[PDB]
């Protein structure tokens with residue numbers, strides 16, 4: 001009973017729902033097989049991610065998902081974001097079909113690929129060599145910046161940029177997720193800890209936390225936090241600092257320390273992203289160019 005958009009509409013019978021991936025404030029995500037997503041190959045199978053309402057869904061939950069759907073329609077296609085593939089709005093539950101990223105989010109990707117410590121028995125010529133190398137970490141940071149630059153050009157503010165919301169494909173391509181979400185910025189439980197232990201307040205820019213002001217520069221602040229996550233290999237920001245302490249420390253201008261095995265160039269970018277004045281933080285365009293120089297200088 002939603003209006004039919006033939007541009008995006010996809011036959012729900014061409015979907016085969018599979019294992020649930022996760023749930024969020026107003027919707028849950030399910031992995032599914034899709035047949036003929038490419039109209040040129042009607043019987044071709046592909047793995048997609050389907051977002052839908054829960055079973056305790058209110059009219060507000062539906063409005064948020066519909067709003068998210070329309071946002072994903074408008075923003076367009078970019079390599080470094082999760083793209084809309086199709087929708088199901090006719091004769092059945094509302095489905096929002098988007099791209100798959102096989103390896104999960106960036107935080108879990110990094111944490112599962114930390115190097116082995118000196119308690120492993122040397123076996124092979126690379127027993128001390130881990131899955132993650134410096135140029136790849138820089139690449140991950142570069143791709144997120146380029147994606148954010150794209151979203152900025154489309155006048156889109158993420159409002160909760162984090163490693164948890166960056167997805168990793170089979171080819172280690174970074175794809176920014178959940179950029180068009182209604183997040184209820186006028187009623188944030190700053191003390192609320194997620195089921196995986198995350199405190200989202202630690203990613204908020206000061207103007208967002210204290211003044212409820214969101215700009216693209218507030219996302220830049222979050223990007224700085226995301227930079228810290230990457231080069232801590234999926235570490236949690238402000239280590240061992242409870243929310244109450246975070247409030248006062250931020251008011252005192254406290255910033256995170258330089259993480260171990262992190263070159264000064266990248267901690268430099270982090271601190272620039274954490275400049276008190278939003279205008280003194282780099283733009284995403286500048287971040288892309290800055291990270292590009294580092295990436296090129298380490299990719300011989």
Ligand SMILES: CCC(=O)Nc1cc(N2CCC(N3CCOCC3)CC2)cc(F)c1Nc1n[nH]c2ccc(O[C@H](C)c3c(Cl)cncc3Cl)cc12
Nearest residue numbers: 021022023029031048049099100101102104105164167177
């Ligand atoms: C489509 C291919 C696929 O399955 N991808 C996938 C699996 C997962 N998981 C989560 C962990 C899960 N393990 C299974 C074993 O027990 C521990 C959890 C394995 C599958 C997480 C993802 F982010 C993804 N990547 C996503 N691709 N496309 C998405 C669209 C929405 C989406 O949302 C969910 C709620 C999500 C999740 Cl589950 C984790 N981080 C961020 C997001 Cl936004 C994730 C993906």
